[model samples]
Each structure stands twice: as C-alpha cells, then as structure tokens.
Target: GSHMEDFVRQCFNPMIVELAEKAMKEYGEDPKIETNKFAATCTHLEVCFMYSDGGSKHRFEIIEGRDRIMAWTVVNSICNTTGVEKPKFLPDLYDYKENRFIEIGVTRREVHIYYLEKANKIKSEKTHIHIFSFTGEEMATKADYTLDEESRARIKTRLFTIRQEMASRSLWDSFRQSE
Candidate 1:
C-alpha cells in the first residue's frame, strides 16, 4: 500500500467504466483503458479513455485499510458505500493549504468537475471537491483546503445532487481491496 501496485481485469462490473468507454468510442477508436494483467491489490481495475490520437489514463486503486475513503468512491456509477464488492478507484489523497475554487457538475455522459481541499478550516465550505466527468474524461482541478459544519452541510446537498444525477443517468456502470 505504501508503494503503488498495478494489474488489469476485463471489468466484471461493466457498467461505469465499460459504458464510459463505449461512449468515448464515439469520439474515436475506443482506446482500450488497459487493465492490469493480474488482479493486484493496489491496482485492481484499469480504465482507459480513447482519443483521436492516443490518450491519458488513470489506475483506480483499492486501499485495503479504509472503507471510509472507499465509501466515498465511484464504481459502476455507484458509491462503494452501497456494499458492492467493486474496488475503490481512488485518486491519490492530496495535502493542501490555502483557499481554492472550482466548479464541478455532471451531465448525462460523464463527471464534469471536482476540486478537493478536504480540510475546511483552510478554505470555504462552498469550496469543495467537486465531482465531475464530461463525455468521458476526468476534469480535475486542485483548490485550497477547507472543512467545517457548513461545508459538511453543503457537501450533503452536493452529494444529493450527485446521487440524483448518477441515478438519473446511470447508463449502467462499474473499486477497492486492501493490498
């Protein structure tokens, strides 16, 4: 868990990641989001976004230690909190200070945006880790750290919005294990 691990699977869930790829294929050759060759703990599933010419990729990993964080992750278009066995495809936790700003929204196709300063004391509660995807790309931005009662309330509102959005548009989707 300290160092990163990698592997690939055919994606049994086949909803979130696979469907996203199916959408992206509309853009060009369905860039095979390469999965790790073996089911490694750190890297469980490999997802790829195709491009007109080559593309960018991220390996969503499963940390064996904390279900708390995994509960906050997206898989098969659902949060792991739902009790699915899918891995928690988490981005690296960021350490941040200072105020930051970013707008995150979701369309029927993908995550639109997200800016995370998980700690509210350093920034605005309104300033949050926005979750977004667009047509099948990770549109991410970093921001100042902040956390508080107000932000938690705001995050609850945002979570509702996101859950509604994901539920409404679940085109059908796709997680983590301790290594």
Candidate 2:
C-alpha cells in the first residue's frame, strides 16, 4: 500500500507530465483540432487524454488506483509505438491557434497521412488516447463542429478505412486487445 505511490508515479510521471506537456506544447494550449469549417475533421484529429485518475477531482493521487497509471501507460506506449514519428499535420484548413504549422513543416498532407495510417491502430480501446473518442457533437462547438458536405465525405473515407480494419478484428476479441 505504501509503495503504491512510488510505483504509480514512477510508471506514470512520464506520461502525465512529460507526454501531456509535449503534446500541449506542440498542439497548443487549447488543443482542439479545428479545420476551419470542418470541425469534424478535428474530431478524430484531436488527441484526448487519460489522466492520473478520475472522479470529482481533476486527476488524482497516483496511489488511488491502477486505472490511471495504466491509462497513462496506454497513452504513452501508443504514441511511441503507433507511428514512424508523431503524425504532424491536420487537414489543409487546420488551425493550431498559434498558426505555426508552416514553421514546423507540419502542413503537408502526405507526411501526416503516412503517420496517420499507422495511428489507425490507436483506435483500439486499450490504446485509446482517452476513455473515449470525441464525437463531432461532443465538443462545445456543436454548431461549428457540425459536419458539412466536405467533412461528411472526409469522415466517410476515414470511417471506411477504420471499419475495414475493424471488420477483420471483430472476429477476435478486439475489446480486450491493446495496441
């Protein structure tokens, strides 16, 4: 019991502090992935989070439960293992708030897609960035985030690709599976 805190922080400190900070710095403070009119493009494009823990408290004491630490492990492992490097771009209309994609060369669709294809695996629940994926409607910007024709088409393509992988995975217990 006493040792749990040490074990928990040792395991999760990297993710809660380091990884989250890195993602925020790269993606910006309010890391909503808006693609101009196509906030739906930002739906899957955003990186949600698994915190140190949950409940009335924002995060938690690391020793409270293994769920939080394990969640961090899951997020960090997925980020490191899912792609050649962290995927760098969003749709052309992408806005990072800071508007610095050009400086980072992260505006290139080809480069981002290459990594995104690999990141498809992150959709697995065990590797899910958060407890759940954000729906376009879930964000506060329900009106702005609403899907338009272009977004519908883009999401359709994304859905098709993700579904194809799920079709085969459905044969297995994809639920219990981790990335």
Which candidate has the highest lDDT of all?
1
Candidate 1: tens digits of C-alpha lDDT, residues 18-54: 4334434533533343221122221112211111012
Q: Candidate 1: where is the Cα deviation over 4 Å?
A: 1-9, 12-65, 69-94, 97-127, 134-179
Tell me the deviation in Å of residue 111 in model 1: 5.8
Local distance difference test, candidate 1: 0.29
- lDDT of every predicted structure (CA atoms): 0.29, 0.27
Residue 90 lDDT in candidate 1 = 33
In model 2, residue pairs whose N, Cα or C atoms come closer than 3 Å (at least 3 residues apart or on different chains), thus clashing, are none
- lDDT score, residue 168, model 2? 53
Measured against the true structure, the TM-scores of the candidates, in listed sequence, are: 0.20, 0.22
Report the number of the highest-TM-score candidate. Answer: 2
The per-prediction tally of clashing pairs is 34, 0
RMSD of each: 17.3, 19.8
